[PDB]
Amino acid sequence: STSASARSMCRVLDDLLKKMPMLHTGGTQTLTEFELKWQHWREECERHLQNGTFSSNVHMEAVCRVLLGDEEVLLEKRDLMTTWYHFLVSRLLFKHPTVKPTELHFYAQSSLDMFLAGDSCPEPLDNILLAAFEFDIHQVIKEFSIVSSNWWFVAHLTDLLDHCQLFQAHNLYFGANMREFLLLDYASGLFSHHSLWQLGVDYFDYCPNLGREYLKLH
Amino acid sequence: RSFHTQLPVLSESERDMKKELQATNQQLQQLGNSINQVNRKMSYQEKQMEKGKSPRKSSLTLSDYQKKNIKAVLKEHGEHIQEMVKQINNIRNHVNF
Amino acid sequence: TLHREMEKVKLDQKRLDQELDFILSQQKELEDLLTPLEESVKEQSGTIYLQHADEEREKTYKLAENIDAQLKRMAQDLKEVIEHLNTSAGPGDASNPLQQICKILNAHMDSLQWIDQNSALLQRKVEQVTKECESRRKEQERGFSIAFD
Amino acid sequence: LESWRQLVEIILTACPQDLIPTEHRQLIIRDLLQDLHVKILDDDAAQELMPIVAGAVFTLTAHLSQSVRTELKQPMTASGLGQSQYVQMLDGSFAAPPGTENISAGFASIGDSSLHMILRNLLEFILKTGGGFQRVRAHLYGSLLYYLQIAQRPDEPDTLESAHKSMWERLTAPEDVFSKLQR
Amino acid sequence: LEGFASIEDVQQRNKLKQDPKYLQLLYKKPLDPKSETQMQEIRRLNQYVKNAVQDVNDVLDLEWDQYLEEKQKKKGIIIPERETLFNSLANHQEIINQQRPKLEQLVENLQKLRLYNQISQWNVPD
Amino acid sequence: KMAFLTRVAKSSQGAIELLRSGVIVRLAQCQVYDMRPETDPHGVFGMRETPVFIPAPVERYRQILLPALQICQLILTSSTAQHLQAAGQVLQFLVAHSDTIQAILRSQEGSLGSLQELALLTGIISKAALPGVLNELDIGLNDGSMMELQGHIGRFQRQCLALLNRFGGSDRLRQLSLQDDSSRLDGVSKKDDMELAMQQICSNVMEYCQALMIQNSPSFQQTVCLFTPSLKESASRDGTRQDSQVSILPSWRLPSLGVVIHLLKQSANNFFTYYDIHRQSVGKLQNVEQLPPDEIKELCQSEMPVGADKISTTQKYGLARRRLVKLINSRAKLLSLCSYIIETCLYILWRHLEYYLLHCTTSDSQDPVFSNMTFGNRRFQDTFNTDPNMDPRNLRQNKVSQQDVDTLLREGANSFGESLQKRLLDIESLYCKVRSRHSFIQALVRRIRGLLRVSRV
């Protein structure tokens, strides 16, 4: 409505964006409908670009070049995206309809690689996120316990992994039961203070082993 | 040997190669420490082993032919391994032909 | 019998001489073709690229070379350790044959894995060729049906 | 209980059940069923004896099924003639031509209220305990499957009209007793 | 022939290094023969070293235990290895009987992939 | 599990629930149907190199696919309002897995389960893969996808025609019985299963043929034919076919009315044979009350090969009665299916004669009698009509010579003797349809007789 040379352009853009797949449910989770919608969207975009209704304008041409799925254009316009996870989700949205867990780690690794190549530096949190994307719960919680000293976060993560009914480790890479060690560490850190010692009682009652003698000594 | 200083830009499998090489490096350091301590242990215990007694390793005493049969079987298995390596080489050569 | 044997031996030796002459000619040709290539790789090795991925790949290759060198050195160390410990077990079937048994078992396992990988690659290539032939046959059948209709 | 299990195992896979008359067979079977149902209503198992008593229930249900199956057959086909059987308890009299009169007599000899209270006691014993694990629930479901085999008939997978269909042992015809029991 | 293939691949990669599309080609390729054989040799050496040092440590521990027994109790025996040898022989036989169909399939594929022309011409690349 | 699936698919509410949940989509997305050792896209080229698995790879794959095809046919037959989308997703899955489907259709043996699998596949194709179905529904969802749909439908129709030409011989029954006869005592049940599979194949064929005439209910003046005027196909099929390899008719000229005549004659002969066997079985069941013990023992041995000699006389009588009841039910089903297939063959012959009369007969003359080419009540078209010169369309339609049509009519009138007339009369007297389509048996009979005894101008 503002620019006089963009009415039909925005109309064509809105008509093209209507073919976006918003997770169809034709009975169950089907990827065929998503793939067909993505193919139809790509075909409509290519047809518009070849006809000319989506050309002869620098702004919309750059928009289409970004939507097609490139890397150098996004590295130049990095002021819009956030970090490596934003780059990865942008690639997965503008390059493929959907991805599988067998290729998600590969795509995330390639995203982090080209993001670091395009003027960047390594980062411990970035490496932790890359490990989380590469899965292996044992090694990601090992990296978490190595880097971050927050015992409550590791305790919550172990509780979630136990609630999810997954195979967990019964040893703390030296003794046994990681949740008991985390609760004992939090109890020590809380007793280091001079106030609030009520949660330690229940956290020691939850441990039917060293918690009794620990509370009796504290 | 001089080609390991070129090849610009990583690939899709280069990061997996890097992480596997890091795992192999830490495993090699651990095994090197183990070998270093085992060498000292053996250098300290060799005199005691020579002063004491040496055990036997000749198995199957009731059958005097089973030992040579097992030895010939192991030699023929090694020959089969060599022949299979040669056959794989010939197969890839004929494929490249 | 001796005459037949020496005649067969002379024929085989003449054939082997011809084969060795051909092999020597091929080796001389390979050497003459490789002589100008020995100086081209030396000049390309000095071109060090400066990038977040190029330097990463260079460091990865250097670490791989160092790992291979250290592995070869410590493998020679383990070999001499085994050859020194062979006198500790005393006489036997093959002087402590457990090491040789484990070595040949691992070698046969790796050979089986390589054979399986090669067979999978050959089956994939055969399947790709068969799919190309099937697509060609389907196109031909579609053209024939169009010409018939 | 182990002696009872050995006894029922010998009755199942060691000795047949076709010597005394079928009427006395069914009478003794129904009396034993009512007795064991009163026993399981008065409780006998706790936590460790539940699989054993469930296996015993399965074995006695198999015994009842074998008795019902043998009640229909006859030796040399001599007493299975005539019509209008006079041996009933709650169900009406059934008539059949020579050749099916024995089957009709064996089918009408079963008591409607007897089967009703049997299934009610079985369901009550199933719903009473809550600690019955895999073996207990499997034995109880096998007993229920044997009861349903006695009542109706099993089927087989197909695509149109090719399933295992057996007559008599069904749930049709409201004038008989199978439809009333199913209702 | 191996050296000829190696110098051919060397020339090919040297010609491809001076191309701008080689970057995208390597970025899109999920595998590479050089890195594949490198990691293969690395894993082979690692497994060989691991099993060798494990058996060496086991033999050293057994020898130390035998020496301690001969120094304390002044007597002892050695357990036989006939069962272990028979198990190893059976395992080798089973692995070779499983590899024989693989060899048959490889031979069939090599004969069906129109690659027997060289064997028919008796080692002729033309 | 598959029995429970069949049970929940038999009901209408259960079928609606399964269609709303997505059982066909789940079966298509399953991983057990990806690595298949069956791949053949109609053409001669096509193979598969699968790793070492359990013995009989294709047989085990067909056995695993059997419950899926069974429940698919069941939900397609018992569908309520979602039948359109059900057939749509079924055809989509069949097109996605057309490799193994065509491989199974092309690979046939003389076993027992192979014939049942082929019959089920043919029925599923006839129920959820038709040009009329494509023209009715899904016509506004990518015609290129619909183009591939009709291409695969034509391929499946060619495969079904080949299977019909292979299994349309009466001697094929006894040829395949010797391949699966495990014992001479169970040979009766083996041949019964073989003839049941053959009748199921013929039922799927007639259902595919009648799927176009059911829609043409308000008007019955349409012809659906595409054969050639040559009755030599009857003599070519009366010989001996091969149920183990690939016996395909010349596709460059299409089948003719000889195959239909041979099928009708074989169906009438099998109908008479089954009627005689059913009468004998009824007599045996009526006289079973006084059968000798040796006779009832022989009957039990013929029923089951197990040594059933130590059982009681009442047990032997019950087993003999059960065997007789099963045989009577099987013979009644066979007679009903034969009568229905004969009525469908009469429909086919009448529509083919009407096509030859008022569509195409001689291509060397542009006569006004050979007008119109609409097939069915809907708006269907056809390529060309009459070509004076040599054209491939003449091989699909009638020949360019009137002598061929005259010889075909003469051979048909000679084959339509008193025996076949009495057979058709007995069939129409013992059976009178089963569905709702107005009684037209006598009309079809008299029209076929008139069009066979008359000549074309």
mmCIF file with all atom_site columns, all heavy atoms in Angstrom, chain D residues 74-77 98-99 102 155 158 161, chain F residues 7 10 70 289 312-315 321 333:
data_model
loop_
_atom_site.group_PDB
_atom_site.id
_atom_site.type_symbol
_atom_site.label_atom_id
_atom_site.label_alt_id
_atom_site.label_comp_id
_atom_site.label_asym_id
_atom_site.label_entity_id
_atom_site.label_seq_id
_atom_site.pdbx_PDB_ins_code
_atom_site.Cartn_x
_atom_site.Cartn_y
_atom_site.Cartn_z
_atom_site.occupancy
_atom_site.B_iso_or_equiv
_atom_site.pdbx_formal_charge
_atom_site.auth_seq_id
_atom_site.auth_comp_id
_atom_site.auth_asym_id
_atom_site.auth_atom_id
_atom_site.pdbx_PDB_model_num
ATOM 1   N N   . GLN D 1 74  ? -19.976 -90.165 21.783 1.00 0.00 ? 74  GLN D N   1
ATOM 2   C CA  . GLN D 1 74  ? -20.582 -91.401 22.248 1.00 0.00 ? 74  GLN D CA  1
ATOM 3   C C   . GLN D 1 74  ? -19.689 -92.564 21.847 1.00 0.00 ? 74  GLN D C   1
ATOM 4   O O   . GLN D 1 74  ? -18.911 -92.455 20.892 1.00 0.00 ? 74  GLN D O   1
ATOM 5   C CB  . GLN D 1 74  ? -21.990 -91.590 21.663 1.00 0.00 ? 74  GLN D CB  1
ATOM 6   C CG  . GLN D 1 74  ? -23.108 -91.093 22.565 1.00 0.00 ? 74  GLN D CG  1
ATOM 7   C CD  . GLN D 1 74  ? -23.555 -92.136 23.571 1.00 0.00 ? 74  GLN D CD  1
ATOM 8   O OE1 . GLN D 1 74  ? -23.845 -93.277 23.211 1.00 0.00 ? 74  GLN D OE1 1
ATOM 9   N NE2 . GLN D 1 74  ? -23.611 -91.748 24.839 1.00 0.00 ? 74  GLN D NE2 1
ATOM 10  N N   . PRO D 1 75  ? -19.765 -93.691 22.568 1.00 0.00 ? 75  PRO D N   1
ATOM 11  C CA  . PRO D 1 75  ? -18.937 -94.853 22.208 1.00 0.00 ? 75  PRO D CA  1
ATOM 12  C C   . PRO D 1 75  ? -19.272 -95.417 20.836 1.00 0.00 ? 75  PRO D C   1
ATOM 13  O O   . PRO D 1 75  ? -18.612 -95.089 19.845 1.00 0.00 ? 75  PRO D O   1
ATOM 14  C CB  . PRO D 1 75  ? -19.250 -95.863 23.319 1.00 0.00 ? 75  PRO D CB  1
ATOM 15  C CG  . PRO D 1 75  ? -19.755 -95.041 24.457 1.00 0.00 ? 75  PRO D CG  1
ATOM 16  C CD  . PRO D 1 75  ? -20.495 -93.903 23.829 1.00 0.00 ? 75  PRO D CD  1
ATOM 17  N N   . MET D 1 76  ? -20.295 -96.270 20.766 1.00 0.00 ? 76  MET D N   1
ATOM 18  C CA  . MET D 1 76  ? -20.693 -96.918 19.523 1.00 0.00 ? 76  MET D CA  1
ATOM 19  C C   . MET D 1 76  ? -21.999 -96.359 18.968 1.00 0.00 ? 76  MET D C   1
ATOM 20  O O   . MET D 1 76  ? -22.630 -96.999 18.119 1.00 0.00 ? 76  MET D O   1
ATOM 21  C CB  . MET D 1 76  ? -20.808 -98.428 19.726 1.00 0.00 ? 76  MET D CB  1
ATOM 22  C CG  . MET D 1 76  ? -19.478 -99.127 19.961 1.00 0.00 ? 76  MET D CG  1
ATOM 23  S SD  . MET D 1 76  ? -18.378 -99.026 18.536 1.00 0.00 ? 76  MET D SD  1
ATOM 24  C CE  . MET D 1 76  ? -17.062 -98.007 19.196 1.00 0.00 ? 76  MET D CE  1
ATOM 25  N N   . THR D 1 77  ? -22.413 -95.178 19.430 1.00 0.00 ? 77  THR D N   1
ATOM 26  C CA  . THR D 1 77  ? -23.642 -94.515 18.989 1.00 0.00 ? 77  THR D CA  1
ATOM 27  C C   . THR D 1 77  ? -24.855 -95.433 19.181 1.00 0.00 ? 77  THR D C   1
ATOM 28  O O   . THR D 1 77  ? -25.429 -95.977 18.235 1.00 0.00 ? 77  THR D O   1
ATOM 29  C CB  . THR D 1 77  ? -23.524 -94.051 17.531 1.00 0.00 ? 77  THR D CB  1
ATOM 30  O OG1 . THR D 1 77  ? -22.213 -93.523 17.299 1.00 0.00 ? 77  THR D OG1 1
ATOM 31  C CG2 . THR D 1 77  ? -24.558 -92.974 17.230 1.00 0.00 ? 77  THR D CG2 1
ATOM 32  N N   . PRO D 1 98  ? -31.435 -88.568 15.267 1.00 0.00 ? 98  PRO D N   1
ATOM 33  C CA  . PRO D 1 98  ? -30.369 -89.518 15.614 1.00 0.00 ? 98  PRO D CA  1
ATOM 34  C C   . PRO D 1 98  ? -29.053 -89.141 14.948 1.00 0.00 ? 98  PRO D C   1
ATOM 35  O O   . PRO D 1 98  ? -28.971 -88.993 13.727 1.00 0.00 ? 98  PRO D O   1
ATOM 36  C CB  . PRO D 1 98  ? -30.904 -90.860 15.098 1.00 0.00 ? 98  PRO D CB  1
ATOM 37  C CG  . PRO D 1 98  ? -32.024 -90.512 14.161 1.00 0.00 ? 98  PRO D CG  1
ATOM 38  C CD  . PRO D 1 98  ? -32.608 -89.245 14.692 1.00 0.00 ? 98  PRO D CD  1
ATOM 39  N N   . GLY D 1 99  ? -28.015 -88.984 15.772 1.00 0.00 ? 99  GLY D N   1
ATOM 40  C CA  . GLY D 1 99  ? -26.707 -88.524 15.335 1.00 0.00 ? 99  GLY D CA  1
ATOM 41  C C   . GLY D 1 99  ? -26.268 -87.241 16.012 1.00 0.00 ? 99  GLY D C   1
ATOM 42  O O   . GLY D 1 99  ? -25.067 -87.031 16.217 1.00 0.00 ? 99  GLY D O   1
ATOM 43  N N   . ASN D 1 102 ? -26.937 -86.873 21.078 1.00 0.00 ? 102 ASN D N   1
ATOM 44  C CA  . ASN D 1 102 ? -25.908 -86.874 22.113 1.00 0.00 ? 102 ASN D CA  1
ATOM 45  C C   . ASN D 1 102 ? -25.275 -85.496 22.262 1.00 0.00 ? 102 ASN D C   1
ATOM 46  O O   . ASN D 1 102 ? -25.012 -85.044 23.383 1.00 0.00 ? 102 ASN D O   1
ATOM 47  C CB  . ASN D 1 102 ? -24.845 -87.924 21.793 1.00 0.00 ? 102 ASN D CB  1
ATOM 48  C CG  . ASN D 1 102 ? -24.517 -87.990 20.316 1.00 0.00 ? 102 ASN D CG  1
ATOM 49  O OD1 . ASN D 1 102 ? -24.968 -87.157 19.531 1.00 0.00 ? 102 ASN D OD1 1
ATOM 50  N ND2 . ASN D 1 102 ? -23.730 -88.987 19.930 1.00 0.00 ? 102 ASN D ND2 1
ATOM 51  N N   . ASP D 1 155 ? -11.924 -68.169 16.100 1.00 0.00 ? 155 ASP D N   1
ATOM 52  C CA  . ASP D 1 155 ? -11.928 -67.779 14.697 1.00 0.00 ? 155 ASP D CA  1
ATOM 53  C C   . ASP D 1 155 ? -10.499 -67.779 14.158 1.00 0.00 ? 155 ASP D C   1
ATOM 54  O O   . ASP D 1 155 ? -9.544  -68.120 14.860 1.00 0.00 ? 155 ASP D O   1
ATOM 55  C CB  . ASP D 1 155 ? -12.581 -66.405 14.515 1.00 0.00 ? 155 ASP D CB  1
ATOM 56  C CG  . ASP D 1 155 ? -14.059 -66.414 14.857 1.00 0.00 ? 155 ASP D CG  1
ATOM 57  O OD1 . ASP D 1 155 ? -14.674 -67.500 14.820 1.00 0.00 ? 155 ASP D OD1 1
ATOM 58  O OD2 . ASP D 1 155 ? -14.606 -65.334 15.162 1.00 0.00 ? 155 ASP D OD2 1
ATOM 59  N N   . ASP D 1 158 ? -8.601  -63.751 8.008  1.00 0.00 ? 158 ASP D N   1
ATOM 60  C CA  . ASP D 1 158 ? -8.942  -63.947 6.604  1.00 0.00 ? 158 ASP D CA  1
ATOM 61  C C   . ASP D 1 158 ? -8.966  -62.578 5.926  1.00 0.00 ? 158 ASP D C   1
ATOM 62  O O   . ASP D 1 158 ? -8.379  -61.615 6.432  1.00 0.00 ? 158 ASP D O   1
ATOM 63  C CB  . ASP D 1 158 ? -10.277 -64.699 6.477  1.00 0.00 ? 158 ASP D CB  1
ATOM 64  C CG  . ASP D 1 158 ? -11.451 -63.894 7.000  1.00 0.00 ? 158 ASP D CG  1
ATOM 65  O OD1 . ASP D 1 158 ? -11.734 -63.973 8.213  1.00 0.00 ? 158 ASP D OD1 1
ATOM 66  O OD2 . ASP D 1 158 ? -12.087 -63.181 6.198  1.00 0.00 ? 158 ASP D OD2 1
ATOM 67  N N   . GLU D 1 161 ? -14.431 -64.060 3.509  1.00 0.00 ? 161 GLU D N   1
ATOM 68  C CA  . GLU D 1 161 ? -15.216 -65.121 4.147  1.00 0.00 ? 161 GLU D CA  1
ATOM 69  C C   . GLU D 1 161 ? -14.370 -66.393 4.142  1.00 0.00 ? 161 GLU D C   1
ATOM 70  O O   . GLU D 1 161 ? -14.581 -67.295 3.328  1.00 0.00 ? 161 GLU D O   1
ATOM 71  C CB  . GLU D 1 161 ? -16.555 -65.320 3.433  1.00 0.00 ? 161 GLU D CB  1
ATOM 72  C CG  . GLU D 1 161 ? -17.498 -64.134 3.534  1.00 0.00 ? 161 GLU D CG  1
ATOM 73  C CD  . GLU D 1 161 ? -18.645 -64.215 2.546  1.00 0.00 ? 161 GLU D CD  1
ATOM 74  O OE1 . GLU D 1 161 ? -19.430 -65.183 2.624  1.00 0.00 ? 161 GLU D OE1 1
ATOM 75  O OE2 . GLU D 1 161 ? -18.759 -63.313 1.691  1.00 0.00 ? 161 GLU D OE2 1
ATOM 76  N N   . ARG F 2 7   ? -10.519 -58.647 12.536 1.00 0.00 ? 7   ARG F N   1
ATOM 77  C CA  . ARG F 2 7   ? -11.771 -58.442 13.257 1.00 0.00 ? 7   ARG F CA  1
ATOM 78  C C   . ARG F 2 7   ? -12.138 -56.965 13.319 1.00 0.00 ? 7   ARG F C   1
ATOM 79  O O   . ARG F 2 7   ? -13.282 -56.585 13.044 1.00 0.00 ? 7   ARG F O   1
ATOM 80  C CB  . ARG F 2 7   ? -11.667 -59.027 14.665 1.00 0.00 ? 7   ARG F CB  1
ATOM 81  C CG  . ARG F 2 7   ? -12.922 -58.842 15.499 1.00 0.00 ? 7   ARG F CG  1
ATOM 82  C CD  . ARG F 2 7   ? -13.839 -60.046 15.378 1.00 0.00 ? 7   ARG F CD  1
ATOM 83  N NE  . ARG F 2 7   ? -13.238 -61.242 15.953 1.00 0.00 ? 7   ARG F NE  1
ATOM 84  C CZ  . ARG F 2 7   ? -13.390 -62.466 15.466 1.00 0.00 ? 7   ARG F CZ  1
ATOM 85  N NH1 . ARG F 2 7   ? -14.119 -62.695 14.387 1.00 0.00 ? 7   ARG F NH1 1
ATOM 86  N NH2 . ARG F 2 7   ? -12.795 -63.486 16.080 1.00 0.00 ? 7   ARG F NH2 1
ATOM 87  N N   . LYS F 2 10  ? -13.222 -55.774 9.857  1.00 0.00 ? 10  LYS F N   1
ATOM 88  C CA  . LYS F 2 10  ? -14.483 -56.272 9.316  1.00 0.00 ? 10  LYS F CA  1
ATOM 89  C C   . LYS F 2 10  ? -15.632 -55.314 9.606  1.00 0.00 ? 10  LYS F C   1
ATOM 90  O O   . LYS F 2 10  ? -16.487 -55.078 8.744  1.00 0.00 ? 10  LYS F O   1
ATOM 91  C CB  . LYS F 2 10  ? -14.788 -57.658 9.887  1.00 0.00 ? 10  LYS F CB  1
ATOM 92  C CG  . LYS F 2 10  ? -14.308 -58.811 9.023  1.00 0.00 ? 10  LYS F CG  1
ATOM 93  C CD  . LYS F 2 10  ? -14.977 -60.115 9.426  1.00 0.00 ? 10  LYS F CD  1
ATOM 94  C CE  . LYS F 2 10  ? -14.454 -61.283 8.605  1.00 0.00 ? 10  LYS F CE  1
ATOM 95  N NZ  . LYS F 2 10  ? -13.199 -61.845 9.175  1.00 0.00 ? 10  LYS F NZ  1
ATOM 96  N N   . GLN F 2 70  ? -4.462  -58.225 3.058  1.00 0.00 ? 70  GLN F N   1
ATOM 97  C CA  . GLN F 2 70  ? -5.754  -58.709 3.532  1.00 0.00 ? 70  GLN F CA  1
ATOM 98  C C   . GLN F 2 70  ? -6.541  -57.597 4.211  1.00 0.00 ? 70  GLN F C   1
ATOM 99  O O   . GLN F 2 70  ? -7.711  -57.361 3.888  1.00 0.00 ? 70  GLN F O   1
ATOM 100 C CB  . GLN F 2 70  ? -5.553  -59.886 4.489  1.00 0.00 ? 70  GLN F CB  1
ATOM 101 C CG  . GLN F 2 70  ? -5.352  -61.228 3.802  1.00 0.00 ? 70  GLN F CG  1
ATOM 102 C CD  . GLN F 2 70  ? -5.155  -62.362 4.788  1.00 0.00 ? 70  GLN F CD  1
ATOM 103 O OE1 . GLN F 2 70  ? -4.215  -62.352 5.583  1.00 0.00 ? 70  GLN F OE1 1
ATOM 104 N NE2 . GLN F 2 70  ? -6.040  -63.350 4.739  1.00 0.00 ? 70  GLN F NE2 1
ATOM 105 N N   . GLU F 2 289 ? -26.415 -91.731 7.549  1.00 0.00 ? 289 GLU F N   1
ATOM 106 C CA  . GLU F 2 289 ? -26.943 -92.346 8.760  1.00 0.00 ? 289 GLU F CA  1
ATOM 107 C C   . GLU F 2 289 ? -26.808 -93.863 8.765  1.00 0.00 ? 289 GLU F C   1
ATOM 108 O O   . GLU F 2 289 ? -26.947 -94.475 9.828  1.00 0.00 ? 289 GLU F O   1
ATOM 109 C CB  . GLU F 2 289 ? -28.411 -91.959 8.947  1.00 0.00 ? 289 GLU F CB  1
ATOM 110 C CG  . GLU F 2 289 ? -28.616 -90.567 9.521  1.00 0.00 ? 289 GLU F CG  1
ATOM 111 C CD  . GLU F 2 289 ? -27.719 -90.291 10.713 1.00 0.00 ? 289 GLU F CD  1
ATOM 112 O OE1 . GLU F 2 289 ? -27.924 -90.922 11.771 1.00 0.00 ? 289 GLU F OE1 1
ATOM 113 O OE2 . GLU F 2 289 ? -26.808 -89.445 10.590 1.00 0.00 ? 289 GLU F OE2 1
ATOM 114 N N   . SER F 2 312 ? -13.746 -93.201 18.055 1.00 0.00 ? 312 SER F N   1
ATOM 115 C CA  . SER F 2 312 ? -15.014 -93.895 18.207 1.00 0.00 ? 312 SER F CA  1
ATOM 116 C C   . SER F 2 312 ? -15.850 -93.779 16.933 1.00 0.00 ? 312 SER F C   1
ATOM 117 O O   . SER F 2 312 ? -15.576 -92.971 16.041 1.00 0.00 ? 312 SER F O   1
ATOM 118 C CB  . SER F 2 312 ? -15.787 -93.340 19.403 1.00 0.00 ? 312 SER F CB  1
ATOM 119 O OG  . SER F 2 312 ? -16.101 -91.971 19.217 1.00 0.00 ? 312 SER F OG  1
ATOM 120 N N   . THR F 2 313 ? -16.891 -94.613 16.860 1.00 0.00 ? 313 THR F N   1
ATOM 121 C CA  . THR F 2 313 ? -17.787 -94.580 15.709 1.00 0.00 ? 313 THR F CA  1
ATOM 122 C C   . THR F 2 313 ? -18.528 -93.250 15.630 1.00 0.00 ? 313 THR F C   1
ATOM 123 O O   . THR F 2 313 ? -18.737 -92.711 14.537 1.00 0.00 ? 313 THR F O   1
ATOM 124 C CB  . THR F 2 313 ? -18.780 -95.741 15.780 1.00 0.00 ? 313 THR F CB  1
ATOM 125 O OG1 . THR F 2 313 ? -18.078 -96.953 16.087 1.00 0.00 ? 313 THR F OG1 1
ATOM 126 C CG2 . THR F 2 313 ? -19.503 -95.906 14.451 1.00 0.00 ? 313 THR F CG2 1
ATOM 127 N N   . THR F 2 314 ? -18.924 -92.701 16.780 1.00 0.00 ? 314 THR F N   1
ATOM 128 C CA  . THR F 2 314 ? -19.579 -91.397 16.786 1.00 0.00 ? 314 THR F CA  1
ATOM 129 C C   . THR F 2 314 ? -18.626 -90.300 16.328 1.00 0.00 ? 314 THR F C   1
ATOM 130 O O   . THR F 2 314 ? -19.029 -89.385 15.600 1.00 0.00 ? 314 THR F O   1
ATOM 131 C CB  . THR F 2 314 ? -20.123 -91.085 18.180 1.00 0.00 ? 314 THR F CB  1
ATOM 132 O OG1 . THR F 2 314 ? -20.830 -92.226 18.684 1.00 0.00 ? 314 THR F OG1 1
ATOM 133 C CG2 . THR F 2 314 ? -21.066 -89.893 18.129 1.00 0.00 ? 314 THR F CG2 1
ATOM 134 N N   . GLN F 2 315 ? -17.358 -90.377 16.738 1.00 0.00 ? 315 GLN F N   1
ATOM 135 C CA  . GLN F 2 315 ? -16.372 -89.405 16.279 1.00 0.00 ? 315 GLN F CA  1
ATOM 136 C C   . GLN F 2 315 ? -16.161 -89.504 14.774 1.00 0.00 ? 315 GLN F C   1
ATOM 137 O O   . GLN F 2 315 ? -16.062 -88.484 14.084 1.00 0.00 ? 315 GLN F O   1
ATOM 138 C CB  . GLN F 2 315 ? -15.052 -89.603 17.023 1.00 0.00 ? 315 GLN F CB  1
ATOM 139 C CG  . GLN F 2 315 ? -13.945 -88.655 16.595 1.00 0.00 ? 315 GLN F CG  1
ATOM 140 C CD  . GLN F 2 315 ? -14.114 -87.262 17.168 1.00 0.00 ? 315 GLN F CD  1
ATOM 141 O OE1 . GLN F 2 315 ? -14.395 -86.308 16.441 1.00 0.00 ? 315 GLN F OE1 1
ATOM 142 N NE2 . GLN F 2 315 ? -13.943 -87.136 18.480 1.00 0.00 ? 315 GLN F NE2 1
ATOM 143 N N   . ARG F 2 321 ? -19.531 -86.168 8.707  1.00 0.00 ? 321 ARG F N   1
ATOM 144 C CA  . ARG F 2 321 ? -20.578 -85.175 8.497  1.00 0.00 ? 321 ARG F CA  1
ATOM 145 C C   . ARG F 2 321 ? -19.991 -83.780 8.333  1.00 0.00 ? 321 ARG F C   1
ATOM 146 O O   . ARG F 2 321 ? -20.455 -83.000 7.493  1.00 0.00 ? 321 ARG F O   1
ATOM 147 C CB  . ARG F 2 321 ? -21.573 -85.207 9.657  1.00 0.00 ? 321 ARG F CB  1
ATOM 148 C CG  . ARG F 2 321 ? -22.661 -86.259 9.511  1.00 0.00 ? 321 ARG F CG  1
ATOM 149 C CD  . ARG F 2 321 ? -23.550 -86.302 10.742 1.00 0.00 ? 321 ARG F CD  1
ATOM 150 N NE  . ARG F 2 321 ? -22.799 -86.642 11.944 1.00 0.00 ? 321 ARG F NE  1
ATOM 151 C CZ  . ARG F 2 321 ? -23.340 -86.802 13.145 1.00 0.00 ? 321 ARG F CZ  1
ATOM 152 N NH1 . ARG F 2 321 ? -24.640 -86.658 13.341 1.00 0.00 ? 321 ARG F NH1 1
ATOM 153 N NH2 . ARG F 2 321 ? -22.556 -87.114 14.173 1.00 0.00 ? 321 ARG F NH2 1
ATOM 154 N N   . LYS F 2 333 ? -20.667 -72.508 -2.987 1.00 0.00 ? 333 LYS F N   1
ATOM 155 C CA  . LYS F 2 333 ? -19.962 -71.262 -3.269 1.00 0.00 ? 333 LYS F CA  1
ATOM 156 C C   . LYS F 2 333 ? -19.366 -71.274 -4.670 1.00 0.00 ? 333 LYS F C   1
ATOM 157 O O   . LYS F 2 333 ? -19.420 -70.266 -5.388 1.00 0.00 ? 333 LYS F O   1
ATOM 158 C CB  . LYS F 2 333 ? -18.870 -71.026 -2.223 1.00 0.00 ? 333 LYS F CB  1
ATOM 159 C CG  . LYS F 2 333 ? -19.382 -70.460 -0.908 1.00 0.00 ? 333 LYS F CG  1
ATOM 160 C CD  . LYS F 2 333 ? -19.982 -69.077 -1.100 1.00 0.00 ? 333 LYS F CD  1
ATOM 161 C CE  . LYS F 2 333 ? -20.034 -68.312 0.213  1.00 0.00 ? 333 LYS F CE  1
ATOM 162 N NZ  . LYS F 2 333 ? -18.690 -67.816 0.619  1.00 0.00 ? 333 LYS F NZ  1
#
